[PDB]
Amino acid sequence: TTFRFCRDCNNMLYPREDKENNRLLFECRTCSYVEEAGSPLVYRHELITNIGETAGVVQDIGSDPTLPRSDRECPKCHSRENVFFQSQQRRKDTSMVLFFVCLSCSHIFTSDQKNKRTQ
Amino acid sequence: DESAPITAEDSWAVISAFFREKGLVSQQLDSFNQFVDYTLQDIICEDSTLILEQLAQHTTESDNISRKYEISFGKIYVTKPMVNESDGVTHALYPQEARLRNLTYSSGLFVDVKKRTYEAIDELKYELGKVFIGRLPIMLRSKNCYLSEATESDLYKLKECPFDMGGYFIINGSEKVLIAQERSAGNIVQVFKKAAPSPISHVAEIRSALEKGSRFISTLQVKLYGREGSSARTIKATLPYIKQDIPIVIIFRALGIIPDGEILEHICYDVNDWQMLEMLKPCVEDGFVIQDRETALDFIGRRGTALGIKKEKRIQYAKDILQKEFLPHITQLEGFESRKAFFLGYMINRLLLCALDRKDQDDRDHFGKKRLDLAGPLLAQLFKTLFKKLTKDIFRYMQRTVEEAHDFNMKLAINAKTITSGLKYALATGNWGEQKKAMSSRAGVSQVLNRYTYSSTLSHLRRTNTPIAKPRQLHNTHWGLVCPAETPEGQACGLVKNLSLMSCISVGTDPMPIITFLSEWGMEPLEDYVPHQSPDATRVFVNGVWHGVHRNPARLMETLRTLRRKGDINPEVSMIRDIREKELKIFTDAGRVYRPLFIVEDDESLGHKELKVRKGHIAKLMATEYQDEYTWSSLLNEGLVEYIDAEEEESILIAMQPEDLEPAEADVDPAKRIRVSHHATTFTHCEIHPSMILGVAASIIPFPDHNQSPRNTYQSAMGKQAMGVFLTN
Amino acid sequence: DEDPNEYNEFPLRAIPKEDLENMRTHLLKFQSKKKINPVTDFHLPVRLHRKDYPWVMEDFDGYNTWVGSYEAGNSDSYVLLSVEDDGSFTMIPADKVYKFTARNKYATLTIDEAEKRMDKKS
Amino acid sequence: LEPGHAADQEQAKLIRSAIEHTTLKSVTIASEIYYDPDPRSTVIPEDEEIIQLHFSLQQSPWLLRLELDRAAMNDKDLTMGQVGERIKQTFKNDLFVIWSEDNDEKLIIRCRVVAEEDHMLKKIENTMLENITLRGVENIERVVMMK
Amino acid sequence: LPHFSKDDYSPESKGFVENSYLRGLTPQEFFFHAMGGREGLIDTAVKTAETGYIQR
Amino acid sequence: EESLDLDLERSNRQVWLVRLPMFLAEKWRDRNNLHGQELGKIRINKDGSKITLLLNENDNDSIPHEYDLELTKKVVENEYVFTEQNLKKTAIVGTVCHECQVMPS
RNA sequence: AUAUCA
Ligand SMILES: [Mg+2]
Ligand SMILES: [Zn+2]
Ligand SMILES: [Zn+2]
């Protein structure tokens, strides 16, 4: 989604349709502000989420002693130095796929041999 | 070769030192001492001074005279134990005479009192010793007890047994042991899913209470209305003294954070995270009605209370509730809206984080989130209600004696028997409360010390009671802190915990030296936080009070750790760094159960990651063992060993054996048990000895590693009923 | 080290003790969102009054009003540094910092009526 | 099972499918609300092909677009046709439904109604996920086959 | 336990007691057996009154 | 003057806002007003803009330690300084052109 | 009232 606020109010924006020119706007319900929409998408639900998997990957991730290490060669820098964890999306369903974070290039690679990622 | 790695037998030389110093009841004594040396004074100074003002009728002489009288409480004194015989004479009293003549082993409580007088005519206030207040029972072997600085031969002449360990009181001649009471730690943010049939799907709770001073047990609930699949999922919060749950938005507005997005900035810290933000749109719609700070306070003020009809009245209320009853930890002061707003926002962040299935529901049974109220705090709780009982009986007197000008006689004013018999009652009977009119009061807090066998006495001074999710089960967090076998069979099974040998309980220190230290070490104060400017900022807490943020925690954490390992920051203080969650929580807090572990450092010029303690320290200790200059404190200040509570345990990585779990591989005995490996290169700490996970009773079980789990649980119950010499006296 | 470079250093008059407003130098802070422009023909006038104490700021009628509230303190403190024509600096401690703290407005003939409608809701 | 078809595993599956409860929620990846003002031409270039057909061989400019999971649509055996049919038969002539073919890469259902419409569609998507029953009998979840 | 790395689903991590009683238990094996052992003592304790009232 | 009025920021006078450590301010108080309370001097170094604060020798007996300053942004905010005199007149003295923090040394 | 016993 990614929504905007009113400059002047800082209050949130409500969508208004410009019936005449068939176009979407964003009105402020505290002042007389109006701005045209960036995207046609107003609301996104998302039931089968993937946002949470690689959360809290601070560059300090290597400083956690609790995290386990592996000798897996990186897809980028080919470094056999990396820390690993499972999908941080705390759901029942969730697969046991592993996320490896490079102790040099910091690139996040997975063990998923069914699908190919970029997060 | 004084810097050679330590063997497995050497861990006993450290354990020897731990016990040479601490003894078996350090928890019981260290608690009481803290209460006598510090806690006692602060209880006399919280409410302390009381005033009575007599303003005239302003008719004519003898009217038109306005006065104000003061009564102040200064330093508090406490004698060695004494006794007031029938024939007036007061003299010292030793533990043996107490037990035989059924007396109480108590000492005198004395407080400096001052009585000022002031006066005005028809605005300008112009001015016109040490009193006994009660007898406080002493815990044996404490600082105040005669037996504390007593040598072996000394005790024998005193007809006491040197093997006796102290840790009890003597009330009317019977020994009494305060049992540690287990409660959930306060000022703690916890998110819980509210069950299938409920309007509210998840709740963020905070049991806010003061470290000392009245202790407002006001628990704030931040409720997520609507269930997983219901439209209009709003967030409302139940505020103390307010009947209804106010939509979060109005609270922020009443706080001063007026526009949406300024409000949203306090809740969601990532401008990217659309998922959490969509979840806030309903709240914004809910709070759309109220647009300024005033109208927000009226809306809060409307919803009583009772209602308290009058416009000026309701808006004035909401001010007071937000100041005095809403989030009372942090501050109860005035201009701290910014601090309490960011906290509420941190709570909503956690509420939504769990509902978005990114975090797990809080484990209500994590030992790190539990506190143990020992002899110290128990007496502190009782003394508070007992001193406010005395304070308000003196006031009742100051009225009675200003009416008839009967000369404010001190002895008539202060009733000694109030605090004396008020404590004697609790300790005797065991109903921890005021007084002969007790219920609900908690019975069994104080009980008669088991003297069947010596082990029976020891295990009674390490007993824990838990009153009222799955409490009886042995939790992982109980490792090294509580005995896995020593628990009763039936009704109390798993609700009566027994402390492991090396377990100690945090006495409670001062947070300010750490808050002062933090700010000076790169900690940006919350009052000036701008979430989107510093978005990766590690949020720093000291006793569930969010103080600010820090940009390079890596270096700060190392400084704080070096501060502790030096002694500059007390060793009983807990500090944890959850990298993934971007948080640094600090605990100066009383009641936390801790255990000592060996420190391991990657730091070794020659080779790998190795245990700080070397064969040279070990001989340095056994030199002092032969002398009966290198104590347990010596290992602690030399940062070789450290104290780790359950919350801190979460972030460490421990090796069981040092030698067996340190150098890697460059035939094997079949009779020995199958063991794992030292695969970890990450090891932060090492286990002094794994047998230390056991309590007093289980520690007499030979080969408990060769018995079926409950057979061990049985022995740690029977040995308490086994005959033998209990004391040499 | 040696200074091959030049530094311009100005004498700082640690706060003069005796000043007419030695006692009060305060900070009035506005959030950028408020978009207050001091150079406004309209904002030529301005009145600052204690509300009986938050400060109340108001322009001529028809213009926005702001409320000023005091921020919490800390160990460090702020000083205002001003420079004289001669380079010397004079520093003055900030007495208080206020976050302002104004109006909107469009809050008349409403609020109480909207809540009532909301109640006609439950 | 019925006397005859007692050893027939395929008959067991048929009943399993006919009884085990299935909701539009269990098949949906995500639902989206878009402003697509021309009913005949789409702002989403993906969907461009779905229109080109479900038109050849008046309504709201607000679009409810939901993506279904192929893997999920299979375990609880279902077709885009049959899923769409349920929605169509639920909202009758007050909702205009189109759907991407079972063959087509992404699985999509485009819906439109027949001033003020934003909240209206958010109600329609809740009805859709929570109240629309595809297969099965109510109260009957997790149906296992057993020998 | 704090002696293990995170996301360890190994038998040794989730409570598999590899050894015989004759051989002896490792501290980890000992504590896990203790957790499992405590569970039975809890039901023995509870069942006792629940079972009693059913009888009545 | 005009009662309840605010004074003159229109002149666009600029001032700097500096955060100082409590200990330093404590030292500054020591300086005598009669002296004019000259606490020390501010150094502006080039080759990059570096600003530091050094205490006067009189203030302490040792080698004066420079306190580095971290320059900071105005932030999305407008900061103005207003003064209230004993007379209680209120004046809008200046706008904060630059913000800085004096680090402890 | 706590502790305990099978
Ligand atoms: Mg029997
Ligand atoms: Zn606006
Ligand atoms: Zn790499």
UniProtKB/Swiss-Prot annotation, chain A:
Q: Which residues bind Zn(2+) 1?
A: 6, 9, 28, 31
The Gene Ontology CC terms held by the record are: nucleolus; nucleus; RNA polymerase II, core complex
Task: Name one molecular function that GO assigns to this entry.
Answer: DNA-directed RNA polymerase activity
- Keyword Nucleus listed? The answer is yes
The record's SMART domains line, in alphabetical order, gives: RPOL9, ZnF_C2C2
**Does the record carry Amino-acid biosynthesis as a key word?**
no
Name the GO terms of the biological process aspect: maintenance of transcriptional fidelity during transcription elongation by RNA polymerase II; RNA-templated transcription; transcription by RNA polymerase II; transcription elongation by RNA polymerase II; transcription initiation at RNA polymerase II promoter; transcription-coupled nucleotide-excision repair
Zn-finger (TFIIS-type) intervals are 70-110
C4-type zinc finger span: 6-31
Cell compartment(s), UniProt: Nucleus, Nucleolus
Which residues are annotated as modified residue Phosphoserine in the UniProt record?
39
**Which keywords has UniProt assigned to this entry?**
DNA damage, DNA repair, DNA-directed RNA polymerase, Metal-binding, Nucleus, Phosphoprotein, Transcription, Zinc, Zinc-finger
Query: Which InterPro entries does this chain map to?
Result: DNA-dir_RNA_pol-M_15_CS, Rpa12/Rpb9/Rpc10/TFS, Zn_ribbon_RPB9, Zn_ribbon_RPB9_C, Znf_TFIIS
Residues involved in Zn(2+) 2 binding: 74, 77, 102, 105
Family per UniProt? Belongs to the archaeal RpoM/eukaryotic RPA12/RPB9/RPC11 RNA polymerase family.
Additional comment: Present with 2440 molecules/cell in log phase SD medium.
Q: How does it assemble?
A: Component of the RNA polymerase II (Pol II) complex consisting of 12 subunits.
- For this entry, the protein name equals DNA-directed RNA polymerase II subunit RPB9
Source organism (scientific name): Saccharomyces cerevisiae (strain ATCC 204508 / S288c) (Baker's yeast)
The encoding gene is RPB9
Swiss-Prot record, chain B:
Enzymatic reactions: RNA(n) + a ribonucleoside 5'-triphosphate = RNA(n+1) + diphosphate
Task: Name its cellular compartments.
Answer: Nucleus
- Enzyme class, spelled out: transferase
- Keyword annotations: DNA-directed RNA polymerase, Magnesium, Metal-binding, Nucleotidyltransferase, Nucleus, Phosphoprotein, Transcription, Transferase, Zinc, Zinc-finger
- Any Gene Ontology biological process: transcription initiation at RNA polymerase II promoter
Please give the superkingdom of this protein's source: Eukaryota
Q: Where is this region: Fork loop 1?
A: 433-444
EC numbers listed for it are 2.7.7.6
One Gene Ontology molecular-function label:
mRNA binding
- Which cellular component appears as one GO term in the record? cytoplasmic stress granule
> Which positions, given as ranges, span the membrane?
none
Q: List the disulfide bonds.
A: none
State how it assembles. Component of the RNA polymerase II (Pol II) complex consisting of 12 subunits.
Task of the protein: DNA-dependent RNA polymerase catalyzes the transcription of DNA into RNA using the four ribonucleoside triphosphates as substrates. Second largest component of RNA polymerases II which synthesizes mRNA precursors and many functional non-coding RNAs. Proposed to contribute to the polymerase catalytic activity and forms the polymerase active center together with the largest subunit. Pol II is the central component of the basal RNA polymerase II transcription machinery.
* Family, similarity comment: Belongs to the RNA polymerase beta chain family.
What is the name of this protein? DNA-directed RNA polymerase II subunit RPB2
- Protein source organism: Saccharomyces cerevisiae (strain ATCC 204508 / S288c)
Gene of this entry? RPB2
Q: According to the record, which residues of the full protein are present here?
A: 20 to 784 of 1224
From Swiss-Prot, chain E:
Where is it localised?
Answer: Nucleus
Region Bridging helix: start and end of each range?
Answer: 27-39
Q: Check the UniProt entry and state the signal peptide residues, or none.
A: none
What post-translational changes are documented for it?
A: The tandem 7 residues repeats in the C-terminal domain (CTD) can be highly phosphorylated. The phosphorylation activates Pol II. Phosphorylation occurs mainly at residues 'Ser-2' and 'Ser-5' of the heptapeptide repeat. The phosphorylated form of Pol II appears to carry, on average, one phosphate per repeat. The phosphorylation state is believed to result from the balanced action of site-specific CTD kinases and phosphatases, and a 'CTD code' that specifies the position of Pol II within the transcription cycle has been proposed.
Q: What does this protein do?
A: DNA-dependent RNA polymerase catalyzes the transcription of DNA into RNA using the four ribonucleoside triphosphates as substrates. Largest and catalytic component of RNA polymerase II which synthesizes mRNA precursors and many functional non-coding RNAs. Forms the polymerase active center together with the second largest subunit. Pol II is the central component of the basal RNA polymerase II transcription machinery. During a transcription cycle, Pol II, general transcription factors and the Mediator complex assemble as the preinitiation complex (PIC) at the promoter.
Assigned protein family? Belongs to the RNA polymerase beta' chain family.
Task: Please report the name of this protein according to its UniProt entry.
Answer: DNA-directed RNA polymerase II subunit RPB1
Task: Identify the gene encoding this protein.
Answer: RPO21
Covered range of the whole protein: 784 to 839 of 1733
From Swiss-Prot, chain F:
Compartment list: Nucleus
Q: Which residues carry this modification: Phosphoserine?
A: 3
Cystine pairings recorded for this chain:
none
What does UniProt give as the signal peptide span? none
Describe its assembly.
Answer: TFIIF is composed of three different subunits: TFG1/RAP74, TFG2/RAP30 and TAF14.
The miscellaneous remark of the record is: Present with 520 molecules/cell in log phase SD medium.
Function per UniProt: TFIIF is a general transcription initiation factor that binds to RNA polymerase II. Its functions include the recruitment of RNA polymerase II to the promoter bound DNA-TBP-TFIIB complex, decreasing the affinity of RNA polymerase II for non-specific DNA, allowing for the subsequent recruitment of TFIIE and TFIIH, and facilitating RNA polymerase II elongation.
State the similarity comment: Belongs to the TFIIF beta subunit family.
Return the protein name. Transcription initiation factor IIF subunit beta
Give the species.
Answer: Saccharomyces cerevisiae (strain ATCC 204508 / S288c)
Q: What broad taxonomic lineage does this protein's source fall under?
A: Eukaryota, Fungi, Dikarya, Ascomycota, Saccharomycotina
> Coding gene?
TFG2
Q: Which residues of the full protein are shown?
A: 54 to 227 of 400
